[PDB]
Amino acid sequence: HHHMNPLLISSGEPAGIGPDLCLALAETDLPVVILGDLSLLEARASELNLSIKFLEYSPHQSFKKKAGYLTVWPVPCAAPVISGELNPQNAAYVMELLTLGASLCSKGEFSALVTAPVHKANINAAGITFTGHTEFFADFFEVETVVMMLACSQMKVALVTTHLPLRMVPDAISSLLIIKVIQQLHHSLKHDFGIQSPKINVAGLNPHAGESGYLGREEIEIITPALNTLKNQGIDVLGPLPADTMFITNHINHCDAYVAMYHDQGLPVLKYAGFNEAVNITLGLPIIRTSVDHGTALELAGKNKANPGSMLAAVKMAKDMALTR
């Protein structure tokens, strides 16, 4: 073909805003193909009073996207969808979108995967153990270390640990894990974001980075040794820093990415600064995968209230990465 192979969009939890966000792509010229139930997409468009012409995907049709059309790779829900109403019978459908999306991108049929939001509890309620797309894709591709990084114009925040109960965070953090996470972060910033010598600022685990060992020992026993190892590999880390002020910039503390030890240590600030522009990108897979930075927003499904800014940013980032692959 002439144009790039299209981006594949998993439409996510069907009762949530994922379908709505995919329908918002119909008015763009972004080269996207939607994985989802075609009847669902048509019915959601009707509920939203949108006039969209749907095409079924074919590899023998043009990769150039035209406004007003939406190309779909149909995957059938087990049961018809009611907006805002979770149905555990459709959890396997969601997992099929993830599995088919990973597989089709792995084979090069599509140039990148973008994920609309999924409802984790609904998947688990159906009997499918699931902590997030990030771990699902790591397992699918048999990659030991992947990194969740949220990115916006204000900042990039990578996580050492992702979806864990807070009780499990300290035991999950080892020096080796920090090293492997930051090695992947450094590699991606240099090779995929064009940052020649990344500067990475790293939070401590404990308040005030453990208060010189008086408020937890993990900085002394785990984090600082890991950062020393990374420095001696030539990776320009600074830390451990207190998370409550690390995100405040000054004339000298500039960095290319922050590392937070756990989910709620880093994501609240990032989403406060850039919720409607930020992208969740998974580092370390053999495919490009980006994501919205928000959840299913079930109460907004079918209501024309959700902001498509994160989805649009996620598609554009995936496109930019695919063009520079």
Ligand X SMILES: NC(=O)c1ccc[n+]([C@@H]2O[C@H](COP(=O)([O-])OP(=O)(O)OC[C@H]3O[C@@H](n4cnc5c(N)ncnc54)[C@H](O)[C@@H]3O)[C@@H](O)[C@H]2O)c1
| Residue 133, annotated as binding a ligand | yes
Tell me which of 162, 291, 301, 321 binds ligand X, using CB under 6 A.
Answer: 291
DSSP per-residue string spanning 183-209: HHHHHHHHHHS--SS-EEEEE-SSGGG
| Residue 3, annotated as binding a ligand | no
Helix extents (H) in the chain = 18-24, 38-47, 91-106, 120-125, 133-140, 169-172, 175-192, 218, 224-232, 243-246, 263-274, 309-323
CA 269 distance to own-chain centroid: 17
Q: Which stretch, 1-9, 39-47, 89-97, 299-307, contacts ligand X (CB under 6 A)?
A: 299-307
| Residue 119, annotated as binding a ligand | no
Other beta carbons within 10 angstroms of residue 184's beta carbon come to: 19
Shortest reach from residue 251's CB to ligand X, in Å: 34
| Residue 194, annotated as binding a ligand | no
Confirm if 29 and 7 have CB atoms less than 8 A apart: no
Q: How far apart are alpha carbons 3 and 33 in whole angstroms?
A: 14
Shortest reach from residue 201's CB to ligand X, in Å: 24
Residues in the interface with ligand X (CB under 6 A) total: 18
Confirm or reject binding of residue 295 to ligand X (CB under 6 A): yes
Tell me which of 65, 119, 263, 289 binds ligand X, using CB under 6 A.
Answer: 119
Confirm or reject binding of residue 125 to ligand X (CB under 6 A): no
Q: How far apart are alpha carbons 132 and 248 in whole angstroms?
A: 29
Q: How far apart are alpha carbons 80 and 19 in whole angstroms?
A: 14
Q: How far apart are alpha carbons 297 and 304 in whole angstroms?
A: 12
Tell me how long the chain is. 325
Shortest reach from residue 296's CB to ligand X, in Å: 4
Tell me which of 72, 94, 113, 118 binds ligand X, using CB under 6 A.
Answer: 118
DSSP per-residue string spanning 92-158: HHHHHHHHHHHHHHHTTSSSEEEE----HHHHHHTT-----HHHHHHHHTT-S--EEEEE-SS-EEE
- Which residue has the CB atom at the shortest distance from ligand X? 295
Shortest reach from residue 165's CB to ligand X, in Å: 13
Confirm or reject binding of residue 117 to ligand X (CB under 6 A): yes
Tell me which of 57, 273, 307, 316 binds ligand X, using CB under 6 A.
Answer: 307
| Residue 180, annotated as binding a ligand | no
Task: Give the nearer residue to ligand X in terms of CB position, either 175 or 280.
Answer: 280
Binding characters for ligand X, 236-275, by CB under 6 A (x = yes): ----------------------------------------
| Residue 1, annotated as binding a ligand | no
Task: Give the nearer residue to ligand X in terms of CB position, either 132 or 240.
Answer: 132
Q: How far apart are alpha carbons 20 and 25 in whole angstroms?
A: 9
Tell me which residues touch ligand X (CB under 6 A).
17, 115, 117-121, 133, 280, 291-292, 294-297, 300, 306-307
Feature table: binding site:
118, 120, 133-134, 163, 208, 263, 271, 280, 289, 291, 294-297, 299, 307
